[PDB]
Each structure stands twice: as C-alpha cells, then as structure tokens.
Design an enzyme around this catalytic site. Structure first.
Site, PDB file in Angstrom:
ATOM      1  N   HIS A 154       0.855  -1.217   0.000  1.00 19.98           N
ATOM      2  CA  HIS A 154       0.000   0.000   0.000  1.00 19.98           C
ATOM      3  C   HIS A 154       0.879   1.252   0.000  1.00 19.98           C
ATOM      4  CE1 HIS A 154      -3.190  -2.918   1.273  1.00 19.98           C
ATOM      5  NE2 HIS A 154      -3.827  -2.235   0.290  1.00 19.98           N
ATOM      6  N   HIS A 196      -6.226   7.227  -3.226  1.00 20.91           N
ATOM      7  CA  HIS A 196      -7.160   6.231  -2.635  1.00 20.91           C
ATOM      8  C   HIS A 196      -6.550   5.463  -1.463  1.00 20.91           C
ATOM      9  CE1 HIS A 196      -5.251   2.874  -4.690  1.00 20.91           C
ATOM     10  NE2 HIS A 196      -6.015   2.085  -3.945  1.00 20.91           N
ATOM     11  N   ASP A 197      -5.222   5.349  -1.369  1.00 19.29           N
ATOM     12  CA  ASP A 197      -4.568   4.638  -0.231  1.00 19.29           C
ATOM     13  C   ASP A 197      -3.539   5.538   0.463  1.00 19.29           C
ATOM     14  OD1 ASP A 197      -5.845   2.084  -0.063  1.00 19.29           O
ATOM     15  OD2 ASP A 197      -4.519   1.191  -1.568  1.00 19.29           O
TER      16      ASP A 197
HETATM   17 MG   LIG Z   1      -7.480   0.836   0.219  1.00 17.40          MG
HETATM   18 ZN   LIG Z   2      -5.619   0.148  -3.027  1.00 19.15          ZN
END
Ligand SMILES: [Mg+2]
Ligand SMILES: [Zn+2]
EC number: 3.1.4.53
Length: 329
Positions: free
Chosen positions: A78, A118-119
């Site tokens: 991530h 988004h992350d």
């Molecule tokens: Mg996520």
């Molecule tokens: Zn993601």
C-alpha cells in the site's frame, strides 16, 4: 535544456501508459521512486486536464510530490507504486471503447484523482487491526471505513500546503461535484462494500442500454458514479489480471505486508488475521480463492458491461488462476 539519459529511458517506458501491463516497477526505479508523480503528470498532459481545469503545472507537480511523499516507503504493498498502478489502470479502463464520450472531463478528473489518493498514508495494517488496537484513526472515524476516510481526508488536506491547490481555478460548482464523486469513489474501495457494488454492477449489466453509437447509456448520477466506483474498484483489484511477472511482484508485496501484520498481531497476543500467518500460509491456495470468490466475479461482470473490450484482461486472469492452481502442493 533536454533530458538526462535516465529521464529518456523513463519517457520511453511511459509510452506504454495507455496499455495494460505498464512496467510500473521499472518506472518506480527510473523516476527515483516517483512513479505516482510521473504517471499522474503524463496522464494529465495526455488527457489535456491542465488546460481544461487551468491547473498551473508547478502547482500540479508540487501537489503530486507532496501526495507521493505521504505514501509510506516502508509499506511493501500500500505505497506510491500501488497508487501509480491503480491510477494507470483506471486511465486504461476509462479509454475502453464501450465508454467512449460517456464521461465528462470532471468525472474523468474525479476517477483519476480518486485513484491517486485512494490509499494515501496507509500504515500497512487493516481496518480490523486499527479497530482492535484502539488506534486514534479508529476513534476518529468511529470504526467505519477507517483507512478509506483517512485516505480521503489526507488527499484533500494536502491541497492546503504551499502551492498545492490544483483545484484553485475550478468554480465552487465544479469543486462540490468533483469532491462528492472523489469521496463516493474512495469510500467504495473498502472491501466491506464489494458485495453491494458487485450486486449493483450485475443489476446494471442485466438492464444494460446502449446508444446508437454502441456506447453505454448512463443518464443519472447514481448509474454514472456506480460505474466509476466499480471501475476504480476493478483497478484496485487488477493485480491478478496483469501479466504474471507483475502479478507475482504484487503477490510478494501483499504477502510481505500481511505477514508483517500477522507478526505484530502474534507479538501482541492478538488473533492472527486471515492470510497473515507466515507459519500457516498457502499463498497459491489464497490467490486461487481470491480470484474465484472476489476478482473473477468482479472482472467477469465488468467484461459483460463493456463486452467485448475486456476479453484479453479476463483471459489473462483465467491463465493466472490456472498457473497458481498448478503450483498448489
Ligand atoms: Mg485501500
Ligand atoms: Zn488500493
């Protein structure tokens, strides 16, 4: 005045930016760990978004570098490379023939900006881990889509840093619409929302309507945002649909991150989360299970919506699934 030899090899790799299976790890190395910055810049130029939204180029680069810096270099999956991958994957899905001239510039901007943030600031542990440890983040978000709420709040908060407001020239109306779409897209990346998103995508495939020019008909916000939500969700779950050399690098990274969470859980005497026990792991069986229960039903439904545009993506997914099945000891 012109690029270094490294900058030139990077620009040659970025010629694949419109293709499924971009060498995103090679772009990460060549850009000096700036895959999100260089890929976002390339896509913004290609789609003419600087001119359309009057984004000063220095402001765009300052924001992109700031956003990239708030992804954690010590998190194996991530991180900024995953952000870059989801951005580029969303960019390819947006260019699918079945969606030609369907989405406005603002909707395109929302889906790409959403993919990029988004992350952001992902700590490399799950919502459940943050809830069970009584983390400040879980307290702030009342245990509800904790990470996804945080990603959004950071993505927007970073606009307020010095020369970072890439939306400075949008009207209030544009900003309110962009913001609502970005929030709706990122909150839909929470896997707890997967089954409802997939049910709604299936309902849309069953009641699917096409224009005279052969593109999808989406005539209300609810249907348009549902497609953008499922699109970014597909981009987020696109690793198994990539050429196997890329898929296996993503699998190595998610398993490093899961095993690290499992080590933190074991050292604290917590129940070890699914697939996070390095002493009791079936990487191959887990991938086949993930593909069979999550990734294939989603991509099969997406492929139906845009038939036949996604057939080679679905074929790669089925080949990757058979490859992992054949390595189960
Ligand atoms: Mg996520
Ligand atoms: Zn993601």
């Amino acid at each position: 005045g012109v690029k270094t030899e490294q900058e030139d090899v990077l620009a040659k790799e970025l010629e694949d930016v419109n293709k499924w299976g971009l060498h995103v790890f090679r772009i990460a190395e060549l850009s000096g760990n700036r895959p999100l910055t260089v890929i976002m810049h390339t896509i913004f130029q290609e789609r003419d978004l600087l001119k359309t939204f009057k984004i000063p180029v220095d402001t765009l680069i300052t924001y992109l570098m700031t956003l990239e810096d708030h992804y954690h270099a010590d998190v194996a999956y991530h991180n900024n490379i995953h952000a870059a991958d989801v951005v580029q994957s969303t960019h390819v899905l947006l260019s699918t023939p079945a969606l030609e001239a369907v989405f406005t510039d603002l909707e395109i901007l929302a889906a790409i900006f959403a993919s990029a943030i988004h992350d952001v600031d992902h700590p490399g542990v799950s919502n459940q881990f943050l809830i069970n440890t009584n983390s400040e983040l879980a307290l702030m978000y009342n245990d509800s889509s904790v990470l996804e709420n945080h990603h959004l709040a950071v993505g927007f908060k970073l606009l307020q840093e010095e020369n970072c407001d890439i939306f400075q020239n949008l009207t209030k109306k544009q900003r309110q619409s962009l913001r609502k779409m970005v929030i709706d897209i990122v909150l839909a990346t929470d896997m707890s929302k997967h089954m409802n998103l997939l049910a709604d995508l299936k309902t849309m495939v069953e009641t699917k309507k096409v224009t005279s020019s052969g593109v999808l008909l989406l005539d209300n916000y609810s249907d348009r945002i549902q497609v953008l939500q499922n699109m970014v969700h597909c981009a987020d779950l696109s690793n198994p649909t990539k050429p196997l050399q890329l898929y296996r690098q993503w699998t190595d990274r998610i398993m490093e991150e899961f095993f690290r969470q499992g080590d933190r859980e074991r050292e604290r005497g917590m129940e070890i989360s699914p697939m996070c026990d390095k002493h009791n792991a079936s990487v191959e069986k887990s991938q086949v299970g993930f593909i069979d229960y999550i990734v294939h039903p989603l991509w099969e439904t997406w492929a139906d919506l845009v038939h036949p545009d996604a057939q080679d993506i679905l074929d790669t997914l089925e080949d990757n699934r058979e490859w992992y099945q054949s390595t189960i000891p």
